[PDB]
Structure formats: C-alpha cells, structure tokens
Amino acid sequence: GNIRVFCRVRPVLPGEPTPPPGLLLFPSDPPTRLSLSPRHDFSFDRVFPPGSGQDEVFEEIAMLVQSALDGYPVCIFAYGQTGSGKTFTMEGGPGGDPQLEGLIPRALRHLFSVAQELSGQGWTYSFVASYVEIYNETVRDLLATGECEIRRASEELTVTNARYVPVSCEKEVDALLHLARQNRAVARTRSSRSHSVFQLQISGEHSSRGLQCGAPLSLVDLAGSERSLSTLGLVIMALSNKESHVPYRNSKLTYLLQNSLGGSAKMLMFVNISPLEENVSESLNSLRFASKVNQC
Ligand SMILES: Nc1ncnc2c1ncn2[C@@H]1O[C@H](COP(=O)(O)OP(=O)(O)O)[C@@H](O)[C@H]1O
Numbered sequence: 473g474n475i476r477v478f479c480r481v482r483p484v485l486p487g488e489p490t491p492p493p494g495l496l497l498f499p500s501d502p503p504t505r506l507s508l509s510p511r512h513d514f515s516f517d518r519v520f521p522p523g524s525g526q527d528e529v530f531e532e533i534a535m536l537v538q539s540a541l542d543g544y545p546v547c548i549f550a551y552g553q554t555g556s557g558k559t560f561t562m563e564g565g566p567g568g569d570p571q572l573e574g575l576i577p578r579a580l581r582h583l584f585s586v587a588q589e590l591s592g593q594g595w596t597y598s599f600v601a602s603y604v605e606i607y608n609e610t611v612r613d614l615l616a617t618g619e620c621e622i623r624r625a626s627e628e629l630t631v632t633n634a635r636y637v638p639v640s641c642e643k644e645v646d647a648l649l650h651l652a653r654q655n656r657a658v659a660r661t662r663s664s665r666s667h668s669v670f671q672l673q674i675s676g677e678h679s680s681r682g683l684q685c686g687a688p689l690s691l692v693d694l695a696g697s698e699r700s701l702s703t704l705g706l707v708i709m710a711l712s713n714k715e716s717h718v719p720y721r722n723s724k725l726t727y728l729l730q731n732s733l734g735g736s737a738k739m740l741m742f743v744n745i746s747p748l749e750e751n752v753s754e755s756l757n758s759l760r761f762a763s764k765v766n767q768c
C-alpha cells in the first residue's frame with residue numbers, strides 16, 4: 473500500500489570499466505523508468521539517474537519523513553549489492569562535505585526544523601537516536617564509547633547494552649555517525665555483510681492541550697545481496713497478503729523492526745544499482761526484488 477520504491481543508479485567512478493552507454497537508459501513529475509539490456513524494463517516511484525544529488529534524493533521523501541512527527545512509523549531501506557551505494561545514500565560521504573551528506577543527517581535536520589515550526593503551536597519534541605549493527609545473529613552498538621540483545625519493553629523493543637542518545641542539532645547527529653565509522657574502523661582487527669540500523673524515537677507533547685504523539689523513524693543500510701536478507705522479503709509479503717501469521721521472529725532485523733513494518737507504517741525502499749557491465753547479473757536480481765516490493 474503506502475510503500476514507495478525508489479531506484480538509484482550511482483555514477484561510474486574512476487578506475488571502473490566504462491559501461492556500454494546503452495546498458496542503462498532512463499526514458500521519459502519525476503522520472504520513473506529504468507531500462508536494462510528485447511530489453512528489461514522496470515518502473516518505480518522514482519528513478520534517480522547517476523547525476524542525482526543527495527539533496528534531491530532526500531527532497532523526494534521529506535514529506536513522508538515528517539509524518540513520523542504525527543505518530544506514523546517510518547522505515548527506510550537501502551538495498552542492493554555491495555559497492556552499489558547503500559552507505560553513500562544512507563550516511564553519505566565520510567568527509568563532511570555538506571553536498572555529500574545522505575538521508576540520516578538530512579532526515580534529522582528536516583525533523584529538527586519542522587519541530588521548531590510546530591513549537592509555535594504548543595508542541596515540544598524529543599529525539600533519541602540509536603545505531604546498531606546486525607551481523608549473523610549478533611548485535612553490536614555502533615555508538616559504543618566505553619553483549620547486545622534485542623529485548624522487549626510493555627510491548628516496545630529495545631537493544632540492551634546500546635547507547636540511546638538524545639540529539640537536538642545537526643552536529644550531535646554528525647558526531648554519532650563519525651563514532652559509528654570509528655567503531656567500524658576499530659573492528660577491522662564485515663559491514664558489507666551486516667545490517668546497519670539507525671533508529672530515532674520521536675516523542676511529541678502539546679503544552680495546553682492533552683495531546684501526545686510518538687513514532688520510530690528507522691534508516692536501514694542493509695547487508696549486500698549477492699552469491700537474513702531473505703527473511704525481510706518474506707515478512708513484507710506476508711503483510712501484503714494480510715496473512716494471519718507474520719514471521720518477524722525469523723531474523724534479528726525483522727524482530728527488531730516488527731512494529732515499524734505492518735500497520736500504518738510508511739515504508740520507503742531504495743534499491744541501489746551498479747552502472748557496470750560486470751554487475752548486470754546482480755542488478756537484475758536487485759531490480760526484481762524492488763519490482764516485487766512495489767507490488768506488495
Ligand atoms: N550517488 C553517488 N554519487 C557518487 N559516488 C557514489 C554514489 N554512490 C556511491 N558512490 C561511491 O561508490 C562507492 C561504493 O559506495 P557504498 O555506498 O560504499 O556502497 P555499498 O554501501 O552499497 O556497499 C563509494 O566510493 C562511494 O563513494
């Protein structure tokens with residue numbers, strides 16, 4: 473239903489073999505079709521060409537993101553093979569170039585400023601960030617300073633032995649991402665085979681009216697798919713077909729996110745695609761996966 477699927481093809485980078493210019497076309501409100509090489513033809517909510525900037529990728533979903541201030545759970549995924557651009561889309565560049573910042577700092581910046589607009593209407597908002605890594609039935613805290621288990625509250629789920637950090641500006645958010653990169657660097661003494669799960673608990677409360685609101689925003693940099701992950705697909709289809717049973721428990725990822733998947737949760741699916749000829753085989757896999765989600 474309220475599932476949006478977006479496709480993103482990254483630019484060809486230095487050193488990489490130059491692909492045939494007809495390997496990927498982008499025919500012609502935003503562009504929506506991707507053509508591989510009768511010729512495989514796909515269609516999505518938006519197809520971002522290689523020249524797409526980070527700011528444009530976020531602007532397409534800014535309004536869906538702020539519904540998480542209105543009690544809607546929002547769950548965003550980056551899916552695709554290793555080297556296709558999942559981490560660039562989610563985190564962005566590691567060097568602090570503001571044009572290369574990804575969805576996590578742009579989402580949080582956008583939330584901070586809608587929240588300040590709404591404070592003149594009597595609202596106060598609180599934001600609590602966590603960041604955890606799921607590698608083969610193990611959970612590590614990417615925000616450790618300085619064993620983790622997915623546990624219950626009621627019925628909420630948290631991660632034990634993980635930091636839950638109140639954030640209120642862009643610098644505190646950036647510092648958490650840089651800490652995540654430090655902890656990954658130390659762990660070398662892996663992340664291509666791991667889900668990275670960024671969560672922000674949003675609490676709102678009105679001053680003179682007896683109103684409160686609350687919702688999780690999740691930004692998920694999935695493990696690479698090549699050649700855990702299959703369980704996510706199974707969980708998404710079970711909900712599409714209104715199955716009496718949904719097997720959240722079959723993976724630590726769906727078990728953690730089970731309350732941000734069904735129900736009224738808005739779900740955003742970015743499929744990252746490698747432009748290269750050598751990767752045409754895994755690109756087809758990722759595009760079929762995305763085509764399947766978009767019909768669910
Ligand atoms: N949209 C993009 N524009 C420019 N460079 C990109 C883009 N997406 C990915 N890259 C580059 O491609 C390489 C692989 O990206 P990465 O996000 O690490 O892949 P993944 O997380 O999917 O394994 C990185 O060097 C990154 O800088």
Ligand SMILES: [Mg+2]
Nearest residue numbers: 558559663664
């Ligand atoms: Mg990555």
